[PDB]
Design a protein around this ligand. Structure first.
Ligand SMILES: N[C@@H](Cc1ccccc1)C(=O)O
Ligand SMILES: N[C@@H](Cc1ccccc1)C(=O)O
Lengths: 194, 194
């Protein structure tokens, strides 16, 4: 799949344009569904997938919390497209052997679980607060067939192998289970545009 | 609109099935879009709308954070449907004159904003933890054209006029902006033994 990026939709669509902006040069592979987009990467028909993840006003985005780790994928980038509604996307590859070399400008997406008791999330976030680490996304998910715990996806500033994030995530681990890095990637300059 | 419930999708869809489960004997009103679904309730073509909100495995749901309050709607119920995957839905009406009467067995859905600074969410959740209040959903959203604050949706056990939630919500108002009760409704028996 070298230099192919899959997206959900048709040629010329906004998602196609997003691919062409985010990954110049690359050949885009239109797919009808989210599952097909992830399959193309899993199966080697494409190197990357472009997945819508947030909208500022309106939209339906795929829920990736289960499917993306099941497919063995990993987030290597983000993209913002302002159409105003702003659509944010994740860019995902097959899982790399190593994380990017640490330095400035990174963000991290992770998954973790906490139990369904008051203050459970709060205890897991305490290290981040004390370390002065800024989060930028947090979303809860039901567990199938259970209400005794909740899964979370979190986007957070920094790189997991560097301060200040590393020590803060050590504390999150103390008060959660099933901690998994779903991506490490450069934060878009869109976030700092005047 | 009396005894009519609108949903997004084609007839026969899982949302249609959810309507038949949740409101037996009601007439269902298929709508192509999310905007059309909420408009039907706003405009009086339907008394309720069935809106998908979460999936345990996978799915696409409408993002309600902006359009639902704009349409003057209020969440009066929840529903769960098992299809390997569980889909949860909100059931929304035109905003009532008064909240439901305080009593046992309620949950509350709210919106609020916090600043994009470390520990801002953590400070807002401290009161709920101190009060022994259990949350069951939390989801962040982007504000259009600003990265200085983040919008949240929260589902929490209790009724806003009854302890322990009442005092906790009062505290939350000193740690957030634009705090809004979006719904107060019975917790489904699906969370216990249905
Ligand atoms: N950035 C703020 C608010 C926030 C929390 C979590 C997700 C998104 C925003 C914080 O880290 O507390
Ligand atoms: N119920 C736990 C975990 C949780 C937090 C937020 C949303 C969903 C679950 C708490 O209140 O801390």
């Amino acid at each position: 799949g070298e230099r192919i990026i899959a997206f959900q939709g048709r040629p010329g669509a906004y998602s196609d344009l997003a691919c062409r902006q985010a990954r110049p040069g690359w050949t885009t592979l239109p797919c009808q569904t989210f599952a097909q987009t992830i399959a193309a990467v899993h199966d080697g028909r494409a190197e990357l997938a472009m997945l819508a993840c947030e909208n500022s006003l309106a939209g339906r985005v795929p829920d990736i919390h289960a499917l993306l780790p099941e497919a063995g994928l990993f987030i290597v980038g983000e993209h913002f497209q302002r159409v105003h509604n702003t659509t944010r996307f994740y860019i995902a590859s097959r899982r790399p052997a190593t994380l990017p070399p640490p330095g400035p400008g990174f963000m991290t997406t992770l998954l973790f679980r906490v139990n369904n008791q008051p203050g459970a999330l709060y205890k897991a976030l305490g290290g981040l607060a004390t370390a002065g680490v800024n989060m930028t996304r947090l979303e809860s998910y039901m567990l199938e067939g259970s209400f005794s715990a909740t899964q979370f996806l979190m986007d957070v500033e920094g790189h997991p192998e560097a301060p200040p994030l590393a020590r803060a995530l050590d504390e999150l681990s103390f008060f959660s289970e099933q901690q998994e890095i779903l991506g490490v990637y450069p934060a878009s300059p869109f976030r700092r545009k005047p």
